[PDB]
């Protein structure tokens, strides 16, 4: 009979993530970690330390890739009328999708766990001003990291900047990217070939017959610098406007000035490129 089953998740140290899992493709059979303000180590099968290969996990529908070292739980050999303890250490590696929301000071993993660090926290170009809720020694930004695929065993040639965070329960690793060209507070919604702009009553009316929509804006423009994290609006607007002009009005119209930006009731940002016919 089971008198108790203590199940815990321990983080994999940095020196084991880089030197063991990423370099050799194996994982240690002993878990040494800090729990309840004490250094605890568990030996798999109550045996000596050994490197175990990380084999692919059993396939499940609509699940990400995963690797593990052990597949059976170790239980003590039978000895009559005694309480016996058995230790099992299963080194698990899971690719997950992580999501963050504005102001991007923290992110969650697909397993429902929270990481209280900004996804853009790092050491370069103002990444050290991002939010972090952990000690400085729980985070490590490795540069010149060569990721090793655990199935194909093919090292990536291009080095990447890899953040590694050792939370009390696990160790997350993710590729560092700059915040400004990655996130945006606005997303492109519609691309309209023909919005007629009409000036009346001290207001602009942008009417599109294709989608049957009329937007009302103030006469003055909307300053793009006023948009928080608004580095995508300009790029998307220029790209879409150029594409549509090349598609339809390349042989008939010409652009008149740089694209303007207006704010329309309901909170819609209109990037408008006025056009004038060859006449």
């Amino acid at each position, epitope marked *: 009979q089971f008198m108790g089953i203590f199940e815990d998740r321990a983080p994999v140290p940095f*020196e084991e993530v880089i030197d063991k899992i990423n370099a050799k493709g194996v994982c240690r059979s002993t878990a040494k970690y800090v729990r309840n303000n004490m250094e605890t180590t568990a030996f798999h099968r109550d045996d000596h330390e050994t490197d175990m290969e990380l084999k692919p996990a059993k396939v499940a529908t609509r699940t990400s890739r995963g690797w593990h070292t052990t597949d059976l739980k170790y239980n003590p050999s039978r000895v009559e009328a005694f309480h016996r303890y058995g230790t099992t250490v299963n080194c698990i590696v899971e690719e997950v999708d992580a999501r963050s929301v504005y102001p991007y000071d923290e992110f969650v993993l697909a397993t429902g766990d929270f990481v209280y660090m900004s996804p853009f926290y790092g050491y370069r170009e103002g990444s050290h001003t991002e939010h972090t809720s952990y000690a400085a020694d729980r985070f490590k*930004q*490795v540069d010149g990291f060569y990721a090793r695929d655990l199935t194909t065993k093919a*090292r990536a040639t291009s080095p990447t900047t890899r953040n590694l965070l050792t939370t009390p329960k696990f160790t997350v690793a993710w590729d560092w990217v700059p915040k400004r060209p990655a996130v945006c507070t606005m997303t492109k919604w519609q691309e309209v070939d023909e919005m007629l702009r009409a000036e009346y009553g001290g207001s602009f009316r942008f009417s599109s017959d294709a989608i049957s929509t009329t937007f009302t804006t103030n006469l003055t423009q909307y300053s793009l610098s006023r948009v928080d994290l608004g580095d995508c609006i300009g790029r998307d607007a220029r790209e879409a406007i150029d594409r549509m002009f090349a598609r339809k009005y390349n042989a008939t119209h010409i652009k008149v000035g740089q694209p303007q930006y207006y704010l329309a009731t309901g909170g819609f940002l209109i990037a408008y490129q006025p056009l004038l016919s060859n006449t």
Partner: antibody
Amino acid sequence: VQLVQSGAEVKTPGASVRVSCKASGHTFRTFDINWVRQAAGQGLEWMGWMSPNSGNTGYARQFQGRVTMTRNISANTAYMELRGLRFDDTAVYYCARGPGSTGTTGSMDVWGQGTTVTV
Amino acid sequence: AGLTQPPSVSVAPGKTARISCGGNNIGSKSVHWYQQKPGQAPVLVIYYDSDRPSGIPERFSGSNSGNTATLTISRVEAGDEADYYCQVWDSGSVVFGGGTKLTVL
């Protein structure tokens, strides 16, 4: 990232040499700096490693007590300083991004041009 | 805490060159193979015992098992004449191999 070292140095026995290695392109706190020297016509001889993020260093057993490894984060530079020079210290010194704090199994993928030191 | 390498290896241009690196339980370490032409900094040609950096031709290959690591250069060109070093991390230091001077006949 690119590593650029100082010029050649000509010294006398018993003097001290500070070799500078400046990193360009990265914050330089995200990797380690390994100093390794090669004599005239001999093989590579590792000298030490330094973690510019924290300042932690690790030297070879044969270079303990004669090598001081320091850094200037503001100027993005790492310095290796040898004391008590002798005749066999005439060598080409290279700074590289290699093993250390970021991981003991790392590779010396990027190198400096190397400085020639003659006593 | 030392790696044993042959001082010199001579191979005809048409054939393949094998460079060995011996050590106690080197199969548990990542052997990185560096190539050095005269008057140049070493250039990494193999890392993590089996992998080639960007821009490195398919000719180079590596293996590491038991007490021996091996670098194999297939179709040895005349420009492959260089000094090759095997590097692992032992205790708290990286030990460098003695160096093998590959001679192309």
